[PDB]
Amino acid sequence: VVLHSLLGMAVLIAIAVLLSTDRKAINIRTVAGAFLIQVALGALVLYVPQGRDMLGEASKTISNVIAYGNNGVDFLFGGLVSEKMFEVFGGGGFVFALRVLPMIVFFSSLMAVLYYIGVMQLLIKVIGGFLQKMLGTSKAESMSAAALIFVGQTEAPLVVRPYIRRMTESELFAVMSGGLASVAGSVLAGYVQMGVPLPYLIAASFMAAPGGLLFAKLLVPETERTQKPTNVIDAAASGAVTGAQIAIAVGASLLAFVALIAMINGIIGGVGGWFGHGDLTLQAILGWLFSPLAWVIGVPWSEAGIAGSLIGQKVVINEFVAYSEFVKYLKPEAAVQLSDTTKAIISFALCGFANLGSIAVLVGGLSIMAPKRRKDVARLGIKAVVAGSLSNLMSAVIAGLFTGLSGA
Amino acid sequence: LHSLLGMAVLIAIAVLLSTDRKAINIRTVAGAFLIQVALGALVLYVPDMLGEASKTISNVIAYGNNGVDFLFGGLVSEKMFEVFGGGGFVFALRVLPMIVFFSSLMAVLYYIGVMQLLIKVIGGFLQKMLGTSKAESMSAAALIFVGQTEAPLVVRPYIRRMTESELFAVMSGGLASVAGSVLAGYVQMGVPLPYLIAASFMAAPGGLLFAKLLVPETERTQNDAEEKPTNVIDAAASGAVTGAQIAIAVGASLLAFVALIAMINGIIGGVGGWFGHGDLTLQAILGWLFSPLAWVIGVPWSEAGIAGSLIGQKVVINEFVAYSEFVKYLKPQLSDTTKAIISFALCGFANLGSIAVLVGGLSIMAPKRRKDVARLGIKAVVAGSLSNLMSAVIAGLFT
Amino acid sequence: MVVLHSLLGMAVLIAIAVLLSTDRKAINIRTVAGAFLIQVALGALVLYVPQGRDMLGEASKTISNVIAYGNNGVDFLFGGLVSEKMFEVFGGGGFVFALRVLPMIVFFSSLMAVLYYIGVMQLLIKVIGGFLQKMLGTSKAESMSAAALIFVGQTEAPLVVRPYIRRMTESELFAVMSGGLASVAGSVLAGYVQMGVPLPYLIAASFMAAPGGLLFAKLLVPETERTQNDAEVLAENEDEKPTNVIDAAASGAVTGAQIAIAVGASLLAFVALIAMINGIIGGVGGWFGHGDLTLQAILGWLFSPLAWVIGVPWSEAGIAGSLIGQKVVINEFVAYSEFVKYLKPEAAVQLSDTTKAIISFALCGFANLGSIAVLVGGLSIMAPKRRKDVARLGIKAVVAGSLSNLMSAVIAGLFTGLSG
């Protein structure tokens, strides 16, 4: 099993070098260094016991946080989320809008607070310093990843924006990549309340950033030379409301994507008959397309069908859909069994922003800051989505590597 | 025999309130009427097409409820009824998201290129036969396919300098049309879907009619407009968002006006309190106000007052609340001809809140045009209403 | 039945004001003692003397009926989810703050849009503003503002100040600011109602707030400069207006919506955060040996004197302290949220009628630490050059409005101490 995953790594990086603009002029120190850091964090939080403990403790912490969040919701929306629902609607009583989305809100608030007091800025400074020192990468991109872990896509530019101006091509592509692989606080919390394993998610962010910069450099190394809230309360407020527009954005976007995909399965299911298939879903199709990719990453075939199914069902669409069909396999009243290693690899791989929509999310949101580069950015959009994708897939592979411990 | 006279009376009234008696093309208006009624029989009297189409978009709506059942889960499931009752039908959750969906759906269809095609075809047709401006045709097309809120998203290039006519045409045309929101909401309410599809096709060109009656055209049109959806997914997303927040707006507005009119019930009861008459209701006042016209459309004096309150509420409140009180008058008087008549009469979303919308957004795309749009709202309601009424009497004709 | 303690309260408050004030001398006693006297005058008018009490009744039931029209609107929109059946099922948790309240915010927003458009508000405003400007020594503008802040808060733009603010004097500016921070907009008032908070007390709060606003305004930073009034305006482009009554109802409604969402999200955030902090202090306190400690009790322990001063008896001073504290350091809504749970008999703690009154007034206003940034942000758009001077005055402003409410409360303690 070990050499299978090692193989996986080799394959991914291979794909990278293939698609990479410049196959040479890759500084090995920077790259394999970053990589080594990635697998290092993986082994650290996963393999050795102290890792499992500290990680679990993290889960304890922000699960308490989230619990505060649902205290909030329990206040705002009242008993509509209470334990009485399950005695009624049962397995349908879980309201994805009233429960999940508000955590997006709350976290947007909290994260805004953490800008304000300066905690985020502090840690970003630290980890950024770590990256710039160990690899030798430019300051702004390291910092960019650093925040990209911890904060939303709207509050991410707060640090990066002044640097973007004279930013090189590599640096920019690193901003994009790190932005694609990483997941915001808000969406993360959402992922929690959806039922998705937390510890793995944490691991997935902390892997996401360095992997982000890893493929960001691999694809396109650098040629040329490098270079408001009043009081806390207000910060909390602006964070909340910003979180509101974000919330509605997500929720609506999801209803859309789901219903559309349903329609598409209506039609494809239809033409299946012309070709002689009574029933077919888009899911299964993607499951055919990305299955091999699911084999490379180390997942056993029998479950790799569904693995590739879900990965593909992320990339071409988005994450929340994917997880929302994952929890069907998670909640154990079903008969469909999924191996531990499978649950892991999927859990990581589906953690990321990488999709088709995220391109325009970025190009658009980055336009108001430095519109001069809008063309270039749009040009690097797809390759960047590839970067983020490869990052999350690598992380997933690192998961698959470590069998020492078992999932929930 | 009462029908024809009725139609004549409607067109009469419209003219009576119309600005210009010029209307240099009567072939356009009478021809339009001709198109309305012709298609009316075409989907009714003569024989495949309509059945398959109707059930098709029926399945579409089912996709919608799959989306919602995802997002809002149990709350929109059927258990509510065993819990609450018919009062357990939750509008906000059940309906507005459909707006989100149909919106997204458009954007997708625009990116793949279907709506350009459909609207090009139908638009080309109408403007060819009845010989008018193309814009109104376009909007009308979308108004067959989608509803009032989603419609304006196409006409943004042509809105600037709309020659004040095309503008009113889109206004009214929207107001009468049923697709998306009002359509889905209707289906969920349970009123038969295919009859409503027929109502949709029947609603659009009628708008063209009455609009062309009130405010004809002069000035040049075609050339106009001297951020992009990028790929397909982003199109779906962006569309979803825009539609969504539009839906929020819609809901808010609805609650607003409904509430205000209730406030007016309080006003009437208040004044009439010391007037000694007392307990006089807007339901009753409009009940006797639109009653004569309710007689005009061919519905007998028997069961007229019903249409008085219902239509009244359609003008001021909406056709929804009016539909609720309608089905309240259904199961005990209601005559079948008056049933169908008041039914399609109850079809169309045109109201105060409706023009509130299509003034608001349409304004947002044309700020210098704002005063000019908002100035026409009520008369527009008149137009679209009378359109659905033409549709109504026509429904009476095949009864 | 001595209730001299009350006068002592008025004394301490006004005292703190004067002390904190910038220019001692410049205070014009006619203006300040005037405003104060109007505040207490109304205090007696709507409480002690039965006539105004009756009037207050009429108004109460009136807007209560308006509110009923609101709930009918809701009952259409969100349907049976707010119907009675929830209680038979979801019980005491069946009361859904997102469903029960925020819509009323929207509705009143549309209403007040209609009442600007038709012109009722403009007229009433011009009356009250006329009154205050003629009697005591305020300028035209600040008076009209303080008038309109009873009926409409900075939620919807006051827009009587639009020509005036740009190039307006320090004391005047601080008078608008404090004015706003003193009162409650209509919509949020409705919210306060549906939460169960007593209505008439709130009405009295809205009316008492303005003159008190001017009280502490002119106390803290008196008028050192030259008023303008009818002299020179050069107003802009007939503003930007609603077209007809309809588009009014709309703009006001939708505005009411994004306001609703704003409030909802904000409260989610705030409640949860406070729970979090309660976690931290809970733990640390657990190390010092206090297992049970919260932001609340700390605040009550901090604001207790202010509690005893305003006429609240000591026993209840802890609670009044915690509440008013949450008014100042967080916002008013949260405060009420913890408050109403003391208004139902099913709840353990009982509060003396006088105390209920007093607190119920004191928490009425936008005075908090967020409304500074809100003001600055909304105010700058009208007058960009002014922003600096504004932010300079934000804090002193919050103090002002806060104290204004406090005076109001004291008054209530006295007169409801009598009539009851």
From TrEMBL, chain A:
The keyword Protein biosynthesis does not apply. Residues 200-400 form the Concentrative nucleoside transporter C-terminal domain. Residues 97-195 form the Nucleoside transporter/FeoB GTPase Gate domain. Residues 7-80 form the Concentrative nucleoside transporter N-terminal domain. InterPro entries: C_nuclsd_transpt, C_nuclsd_transpt_met_bac, CNT_C_dom, CNT_N_dom, Gate_dom. The chain crosses the membrane at residues 5-21, 28-48, 94-117, 172-192, 198-220, 246-268, 344-368, 380-402. It is found in: Cell membrane. Keywords: Cell membrane, Membrane, Transmembrane, Transmembrane helix, Transport. One of its GO terms (cellular component) is plasma membrane. One of its GO terms (molecular function) is nucleoside transmembrane transporter activity. It comes from the Bacteria. Belongs to the concentrative nucleoside transporter (CNT) (TC 2.A.41) family. This is Nucleoside permease. The lineage of its organism: Bacteria, Pseudomonadati, Pseudomonadota, Betaproteobacteria, Neisseriales.
UniProtKB/TrEMBL annotation, chain B:
GO terms for molecular function: nucleoside transmembrane transporter activity; symporter activity. It is found in: Cell membrane. It comes from the Bacteria. Residues 92-190 form the Nucleoside transporter/FeoB GTPase Gate domain. Residues 195-396 form the Concentrative nucleoside transporter C-terminal domain. One of its GO terms (cellular component) is plasma membrane. InterPro entries: C_nuclsd_transpt, C_nuclsd_transpt_met_bac, CNT_C_dom, CNT_N_dom, Gate_dom. This is Nucleoside permease. The gene is nupC.
UniProtKB/TrEMBL annotation, chain C:
Belongs to the concentrative nucleoside transporter (CNT) (TC 2.A.41) family. InterPro entries: C_nuclsd_transpt, C_nuclsd_transpt_met_bac, CNT_C_dom, CNT_N_dom, Gate_dom. Residues 8-81 form the Concentrative nucleoside transporter N-terminal domain. This is Nucleoside permease. GO terms for cellular component: plasma membrane. The chain crosses the membrane at residues 6-22, 29-49, 95-118, 173-193, 199-221, 259-281, 357-381, 393-415. One of its GO terms (molecular function) is nucleoside transmembrane transporter activity. Keywords: Cell membrane, Membrane, Transmembrane, Transmembrane helix, Transport. It is a multi-pass membrane protein. Residues 98-196 form the Nucleoside transporter/FeoB GTPase Gate domain. It comes from the Bacteria. Residues 201-413 form the Concentrative nucleoside transporter C-terminal domain. Pfam families: Gate (PF07670), Nucleos_tra2_C (PF07662), Nucleos_tra2_N (PF01773). Its main location: membrane. It is found in: Cell membrane. The gene is nupC.
